[PDB]
Design a binder for this molecule. Sequence first.
Ligand code: PC1
Ligand code: 3PE
Lengths: 99, 115, 318, 114, 347, 174, 83, 98, 70
Amino acid sequence: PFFDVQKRLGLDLDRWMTIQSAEQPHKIPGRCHAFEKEWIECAHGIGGIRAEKECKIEFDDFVECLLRQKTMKRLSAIKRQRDKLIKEGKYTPPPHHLG
Amino acid sequence: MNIMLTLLTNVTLASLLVLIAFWLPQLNAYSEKTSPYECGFDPMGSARLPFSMKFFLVAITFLLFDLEIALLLPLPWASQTNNLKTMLTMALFLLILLAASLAYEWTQKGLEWAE
Amino acid sequence: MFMINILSLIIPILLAVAFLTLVERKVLGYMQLRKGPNVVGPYGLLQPIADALKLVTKEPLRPGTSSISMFIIAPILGLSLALTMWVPLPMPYPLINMNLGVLFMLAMSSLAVYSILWSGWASNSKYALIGALRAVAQTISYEVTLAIILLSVLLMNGSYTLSTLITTQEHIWMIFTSWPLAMMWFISTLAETNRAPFDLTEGESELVSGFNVEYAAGPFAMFFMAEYANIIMMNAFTAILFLGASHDPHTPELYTINFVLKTLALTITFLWIRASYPRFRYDQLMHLLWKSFLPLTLALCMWHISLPIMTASIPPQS
Amino acid sequence: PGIVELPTLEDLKVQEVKVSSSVLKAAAHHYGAQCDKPNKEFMLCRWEEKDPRRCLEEGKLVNQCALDFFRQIKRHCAEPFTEYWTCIDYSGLQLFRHCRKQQAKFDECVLDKL
Amino acid sequence: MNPIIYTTLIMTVMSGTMLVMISSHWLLIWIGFEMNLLAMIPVLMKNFNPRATEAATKYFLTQATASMMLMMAIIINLLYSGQWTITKMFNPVAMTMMTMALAMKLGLSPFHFWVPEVTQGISLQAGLLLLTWQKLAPLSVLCQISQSINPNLMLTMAMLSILIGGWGGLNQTQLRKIMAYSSIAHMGWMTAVLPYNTTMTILNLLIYITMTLAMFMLLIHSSATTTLSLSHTWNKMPVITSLMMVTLLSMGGLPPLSGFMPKWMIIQEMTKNESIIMPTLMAMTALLNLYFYMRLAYSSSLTMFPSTNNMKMKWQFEHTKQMKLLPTMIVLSTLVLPMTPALSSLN
Amino acid sequence: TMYIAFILSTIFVIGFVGFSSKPSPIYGGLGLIVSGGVGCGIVLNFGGSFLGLMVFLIYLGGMLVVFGYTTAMATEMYPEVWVSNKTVFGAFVSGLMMEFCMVYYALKEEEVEIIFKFNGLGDWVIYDTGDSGFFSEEAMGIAALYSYGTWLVIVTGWSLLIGVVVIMEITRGN
Amino acid sequence: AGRIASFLKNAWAKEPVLVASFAIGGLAIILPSLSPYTNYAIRINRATPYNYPVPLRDDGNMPDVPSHPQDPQGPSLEWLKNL
Amino acid sequence: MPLVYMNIIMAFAIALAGLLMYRSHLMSSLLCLEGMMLSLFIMSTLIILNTHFTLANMMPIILLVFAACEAALGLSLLVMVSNTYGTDYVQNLNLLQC
Amino acid sequence: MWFEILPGIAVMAACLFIPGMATAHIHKFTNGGKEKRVAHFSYQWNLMERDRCISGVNRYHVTKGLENID
Ligand SMILES: CCCCCCCCCCCCCCCCCC(=O)OC[C@H](COP(=O)([O-])OCC[N+](C)(C)C)OC(=O)CCCCCCCCCCCCCCCCC
Ligand SMILES: CCCCCCCCCCCCCCCCCC(=O)OC[C@H](COP(=O)(O)OCCN)OC(=O)CCCCCCCCCCCCCCCCC
């Protein structure tokens, strides 16, 4: 905040909704709870400038968890390469994959 | 999905009832038959009759009340918290603010259908 | 088989509407020292059929100044909403079992206000639009009390699931716990279906027939079917909400008989109001809603939030 | 980067507990009473390790404990248990409150015989 | 309006601004902007003439469009980071969206068109509020996210603001439009140094708010909204016009007055970053603002325009109300240059 | 049945093109409520039952409804129609074709880079695998408004009361 | 004395709806803070086991954690059974 | 990102373009504003449900109520303009050029 | 007199009874003679999905007891 009234008065006005690894109702976990926790525990108290380079791996893992972009690419490659071999009559998917 | 089938059936049967209703009768239409009904004479178009700020004000006040109602709908699950005193304080707070909006509209003319 | 379920829900409801026309005419007649339909069939039992047949063979005059797209969309929306309002109703077991059934009904009935906003606008005539605007304002204003009353009553239910109402009312009716909200809810339901002293949009002696002047024969018939389906549905909702019937899982026919009888009683009361009172003025019903019903409804919502907490009588959410 | 290491298919084989949800629910209270050791031990492993692959043998012991629990039900009053879980199976919410008479004679079995 | 209702609406405007400045959460910052706009719209329409209604409508349209763009930027940022904390933006296009939204709220040059019209269309009190208090929230957000702004976009908008404020104000005979174009130029000066030193932005904002408060209170004291109406003020209260002249000279950044401090500090801080061409351009361009300030000073205090016969009536009357803190605002806007090293208190 | 969220989203964008080409405001409102209905369906397919029903009850039956009501009062002598302008047709057609081109490109390429990178590998693919237990996570998160969201309730209620006061200030007309 | 009684008289005679609504709202405001049962409602909400009660490892010196669900340790719902 | 997000962001872009490219009626622009809000609501809801950010489930409610308050304010402004000029045409809102 | 209104009321009563009875009997027919299982929450859905898998006939309502394994 521009004027950190919350940290001076000890009040929690909006910090409780600020991250998904904060305390949740019924302890329901965030989908990327561990990834966010690891990135936050890496980046804590070293400033944003340092945290941008020195916590790049944790933030990359977090971003992959949030938007599974590289996971989607790998799944798309497996799918489209499977079809690339159905046409030629090369690959037969096994019984547990067809029913 | 069962609900989608149900909606499809309802809409389809309503439209089929339209089609029978709006195509089956035998028709014979002339100009004076389909003339707009005005109790035996012709209507005046005039210029944008649906006016008066009161019709718009009731719509706006309904909109704001409906927004507060949207804020009140999660209440049945809100009573299932261990922190019941905070939840009760906030629910009653929202309802006092609803009552205050009603009272302020009431006292400052507001809800009145004036001259 | 589920399609058969949908059909065996829809078709009997339309038949019940058709014979509700006859029942309403006979109740009004006998309250007025006359008989009503007793010539066309035995005790007028073929009269709804005569009306339906005459209407679909009558020339449906469409206005020359009518946007026909919405002119035909409005009856489709009205009838589709009127029919789909029954799919979550817990005659013992619902057709569609949702967590938020009553929320679904609130939303669907709030979408039904478009059928008047579109019919009045489409009919042009520059005057039926004013009646349509009055009807829309009345409808949206009473939606407020419907929503808040439903909210306050359901704080004993614990959820928006309609099947849970049967469990909530196992030992006692919800009327004995919320009768003031029951009276306000019943009058709000009266006002929402444009019935009784609240029939301002179709005042027979105020604006002839209001938003339904230009509609004739077939589309008029479907609008009528939508309104009467909404009447029976609202009375069924009232019976399930306030007069919960005992349920035997091995004999659901008993619950169905109970529910049907109570729904018919409430519908007969709806027709009973029609024969007993003069008509509210538009500003008079708006004053009633905004200055009489709304403050008490807010106070009772407050009371019904406080009550389960201060008595350790909060229901389960499952 | 790196290979996600996976258990083989035969590292994952177990004698299944092949009874339905109503059968499982009918015995659930006595199941919790009698099978707490391996169940709590496996749940401890699962929350401590945050890894399905690290707790497979504990889950395999969970399965065996459930299996022997059910074989103990079978040999003394399989019949009252069968009636109780049938009555539980009828209702669409599998409610306990509609089956107290059958739960009664299931419960006064396991006391006297087990 | 009811005095209680007007006080409540003013307090709600300030509380929306404070919500913007005290929140760590983007949703609450957006809430503060929403609350500020909601309470601000009626104070624009306080007099209620078609000019006031049009000013309020244009203000509402620009501010609501900016608010929706800001929410979209927040949602894109959350989509890529899952973060609600106001900090560096983790997405570049979200950052661009947010920068454009905040500039439109401020009224920077490519989004400046609303400022002159709205300022002209509202009263002098409404304009005083519009050109002083409404700059705080977007500038505070910008100072919070300054480490992730695109310097090229921000500097482009600031330079355009200076140029357009200089050129647009050259053509004005209306005092409210002159104030609006001066405000555009000063916003450009504020936002040019924002990528480099937010303390300089805060300093320039404080100095500008002091000068604008002094000038608007002098205008309200004079009841003048056109340059010719102000040209009658010498024949009624020449002290007001002389004070206005020294204030206008301060606005032009003439040493040794207080208005020279922000320009001098910003030029120094920019040259510290190998920025020499842009400060030279900015200082040279500000001569336009100084030109139409000097035109106003010529018409108001340094020369005496023809008066009217009906002015003798006004001589026998005093002001019913007195502008609060106006002497302090005048002294602060002109005489504070020897106190410059105190700027480090803003660190 | 395999793709449901994609038809819903394409129809959503089509309705957006329809009402944002700006025919007479009654048809724009019709397009907006069609878009709102299909979007409520979209979030219903994602497990957001309460949120979608909120869309319905408050947006389509509230805010819209009020919008169409107010259009029915402040309109043209002959309230306009879609066809009356070639500009409406041009805008709608350009929007529809830019929808079709980009959905075809994304479907057959799965690596479009219009501002953002996109991959139409599916929409079910991103769903996570787990049990939510005996409650709706959405309802628990929203019911936390009264326990966790005290500040949010305070500011929203104040803004709504201020909204009533503000509307009554502006519309008085003096 | 007579002033407030007369005001209540006039309100009851001319606006009974507002009198009833304000009394009901006031009781809804006031009564929960005096109820012995509000704490009971809090306790009932606390005793509802939505989540799994994931166990702990007894490192020794855990004499108050049960071991078994039917050990004389850990909270008891006997109070709820009779309420 | 999945293609639903693509279409939702596309809807926001179309609503933004429709609002920025004006026509005669003010109500059409207000409807474009409403479309922008609706697309924001759906995008927020999808992001919040997908990542199971449970406490952020309430954020779409707040967005909806605040944007509807702004819509009420804009409707009142339109009504005042129409009472001035008999229409909501934006070309009548040009007397501040001088 | 008034009891001649009863025929129309009886027709209405039959028409209103048909939906509930039909729903109950269809639910019994398509769910193995038992009530249609209710899954308001993901735990109940998972119960039914487990029930379908172990039935061997891809029907959740075919209940395997202690006769299946033990
Ligand atoms: C410990 C307990 C704590 C809680 C206590 C709770 C409160 C108990 C006392 C309150 C009693 C009143 C409750 C609300 C009643 C209505 C409020 C109201 O404004 O009334 C006066 C209002 C207005 O009356 P008015 O016009 O005379 O007064 C207006 C205001 N003054 C006095 C200033 C002029 O009247 C109506 O609402 C009339 C309704 C018209 C329709 C009539 C229908 C008749 C048939 C009804 C049949 C039964 C219905 C239910 C059926 C079953 C449903 C399941
Ligand atoms: C070097 C930088 C500053 C340069 C400017 C210094 C002050 C200039 C003042 C105006 C000069 C131009 C006008 C000259 C013509 C004569 C003055 C005029 O315009 O009006 C005269 C009039 C006299 O009023 P009078 O008749 O006395 O009223 C009696 C009661 N009825 O009214 C007056 O006399 C009003 C005079 C107002 C004076 C205002 C002073 C404001 C603060 C000045 C700060 C100076 C800073 C110097 C450098 C500091 C560096 C840190």
